[model samples]
Target: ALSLDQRIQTLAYEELNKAVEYHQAKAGTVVVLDARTGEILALANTPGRNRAVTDMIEPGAAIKPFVIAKALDAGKTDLNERLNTQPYKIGPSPVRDTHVYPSLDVRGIMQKSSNVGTSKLSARFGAEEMYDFYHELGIGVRMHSGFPGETAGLLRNWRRWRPIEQATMSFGYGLQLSLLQLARAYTALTHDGVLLPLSFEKQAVAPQGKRIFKESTAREVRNLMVSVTEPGGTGTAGAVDGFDVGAKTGTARKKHVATFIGFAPAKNPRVIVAVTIDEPTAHGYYGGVVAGPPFKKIMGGSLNILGISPTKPLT
Candidate 1:
């Protein structure tokens, strides 16, 4: 048998391509990772392209949870304390959410995908700390996925960061990274605040994971992330029928990239899947709308193929 489960791999290949085709997207990528072993079970890209591991983008709100994770680790914010979500200015740039909320806690910010709230919370940590935190998460660094021609996405000098840049970066703009990089960083959250070295090859034993946040902090963030798939959250479409789901949605404007990254069986994640659709022009462009369904299918199929039992009964 192939190291990659044939059934799940085939599902990802067919589903992601059909999804990209249906949406009239320029390109797309789907990655399925084994949460416990850091294995790349399946990786597929549209147009036979290498964009998933190579192309870089600003990654929008999909990157917000990590920033929130940093804030939580630094004791800069609490999950329940409310932050004003009203439109505000960072230098000359105005930061706002798609919908208005007078105030929101950190969990609510993630639930609503609020840029304004993220920017405000970021102010407490400053540029230098945020930059260091991104580095520790392995953003902008070569991920050693054993794939040739992969580029380490850019994270510009912190000393050069302006106030607007800081604010924008907080909500995911100032830095750039490939879809794979973003997916790999999220393993930390799924794996109890530890970042494992990614493997394209199958492994017999679980690899050592470098601790990135306190276990308690990671669990808190993971719990908060579940709201993203709940009724009012941005990623409601990302939920699986019988399992808990935690996800983040990101839509970047210039290229109109739509991305959804998350793990399934949220109480104890067994798999992590990341999906990105670039330049969808047919129906919609938002991450939750464009990329979420494929994420849901891929995650559900992979879990079933791998024989990972669901935490909750199917309705």
Candidate 2:
């Protein structure tokens, strides 16, 4: 049987377990998928369960890239356009950023994880477009990773979306999904807008993928995500020493699950890594810190395991 990549699998298990214990997280998981194919190279979780495939967490601003990508795909927004980010009420409470900002363009909004900015951008689309696009991104769908009790996650039908539900859902609220589901959704971005079906079996040939967005649009959005791991970005910890990374960090306020998802060698991604740390109590529970290091280790280590040449020179 063509099983999981042995060295990469071993690397992930060690890194994920070490991170969970060091952070004192209640639970955690790491999933790595081959960027060119949907084969799962490694899927590791802490103590009791496969939380990566079972636990559903609201994506928080992790959904920003997808939301923004959707808007751009439909010509609803552009990089040059700016959105007012002042704390503005949508339903009851205003969608606010961690820090107050007057305005941000598409790139600024993404780098800053602006809820208010995305809420306004989401206003440009109808409820069904969001719901439909998410379905296309594999939300509320089974990846069938062969884990015992995988969840399909949760996405309410667009027809039933209320005003607040629609508003919050735009920035990764109102719906929930397992970590693997989130990782699978990113296949669209790395594969030039195609959403590949995930597999546990090693792929001998690349599986066919479904088109989710325009190729040019996906490429542009990916270019924007790369900045998320740079100095001024929220996910600098997710960067690898010798590879460019395109990353996003997310937190579910209710669940307090911090997540970081990214791909290495940004322009031509070889591995996609998603790390989720559940309810870190010993230290602060923030995605970039709690989950980012493991992502960096697994991605950087796996690249070495695969013998993939580094994108940048190592110091």
Candidate 3:
């Protein structure tokens, strides 16, 4: 008979190994860390430039969280504050929702990935202020992962700001960073408004991170992030059996990249996963349709293997 501790360890090791295999099988990078301890469970990377963690691909609308987080923190708007989602233009990009994500507030804009709404919010936040948040969140910084081509990304020094540049930058077209960097920045919202540095190597002591906002801000952001996977939210397909999870999906133009970043148990997230599939040529190529289901599968199996019981029954 397996002892309880032994069972837990066996399950954890089993899932960690499986997660590594999943990363290897996909031929992409997978970074998993303990939500509380900053212990990296899996750090898998493939060959070539390793754009997923090293070279930053166009972030698409994934950058909206930072933009929205800033707005909520400054009291510019509350969680339910509305942002018009009409056919507004941002820079050279004629912004429109990928789907029918119409007439949204900050929460709605986040769920629907509204590019125009985010750009307008960014303009209000000011480009320099936005850049400051990115820096606080460690957006362009390199981790100790020792990845060869990791660039700090291009955030201007605030002296030069073309209207179009600021607009596009706000909506995530003009800027790019390793997917790892963006995910780490977003993690700050998960862990009490602090942007802790991510490292591939395990840390003996938890690394101290810069405080980017108040815990209240993180609470509000997490609330909105959770709503994204609900019935009418974008990631409805990503819900798993017997678990409560929250996710946001993103799709970029050049490579048609689909990204899904999520966690389980809205109250206390034990796991965080981000999946990006490039140029998928299928009937439904949207992140909600393509990456969401697979992300659910991976997350579901991974959680069970890690000895995490489901929070509740599947919807």
Candidate 4:
């Protein structure tokens, strides 16, 4: 078994437990990564029997960043491309946002977590291209962490997608993955488009990362992610008091899952934390409300424990 930082693990578990209990949630998971080293610093799941890395759930809007990243990488879209984001229909299915915006640029799309904007952006990709990007990002594949009973999650063949299926997938439906997989994917954004293989074992040498996007493209997406925690963004509450933060919030129905994932000290990230709250009913169910606070706590605490000083204090 790999040894982890006990103090950080305990801090994460305590925060996770408190968040779930305070919200009266059914269950939750928290995964913390040493982004600089590809180390699994902590993985905590509440209601112990419910696992973290193996439990697969619909990712909701949290998957939007990859869609935007792919678009930017392929030159199919630009951050300044104006998208009409008013609620619209995809055949029989109505695709909508939580609140309608008349127009949004690609950056606004992510910052606002605009479902319509995401669908519009994703439409630029062929189904095969979309699936290939997700596959390349490690979706529907075991992370090879040697954890037993880990799920691959569901990712269907691109050729099988109908228009509505494709549209829904733009905002994360008709696909699934574990929270660990989701955290692993976001490493690309934080690390200049390189996706590093995750590790449980302590190592003398850092693992090599696969380049998944152009450095400029990844940096652009990373900057846009910073807007996600800014005023008027979906994850304003996720911001830390002494560090620049970047995050995405996700909320899904059926079982009411909420998630917040991203890195801290935005300009020079060293830690990535993902938090998911299942069936939060007491305080609130939205990711920004239920998951973001704990994410902020864990990320801030991890940075402190790692002896990473903030680049700039929150204004």
The candidate maximizing lDDT is 4
lDDT for position 104 in model 1: 91
Runs in model 1 with CA error above 4 Å?
A: 1-3
Candidates' TM-scores? Answer: 0.96, 0.96, 0.83, 0.96
Query: Which consecutive 10 residues in model 1 have the weakest lDDT in total?
Result: 1-10
Candidate 4 worst ten-residue window by lDDT = 45-54
lDDT tens digits, residues 18-117, model 2? Answer: 8888888888888899987978888888878878888888988788898889889999999899888888775576678889989999999888888888
lDDT for position 256 in model 3: 72
In order of lDDT, best first, we have 4, 2, 1, 3
| Cα lDDT listed for each candidate | 0.86, 0.86, 0.66, 0.87
Q: At residue 242, what lDDT does model 4 achieve? A: 83
Give the CA lDDT, 0 to 100, for residue 102 in model 4: 97
Model 1 per-residue lDDT tens digits across residues 72-187: 88888986688878898756778888988999988888889889888887888868888888888787899765678887998888899998888898898978998888888888
27, model 4: CA deviation in Å? 0.8
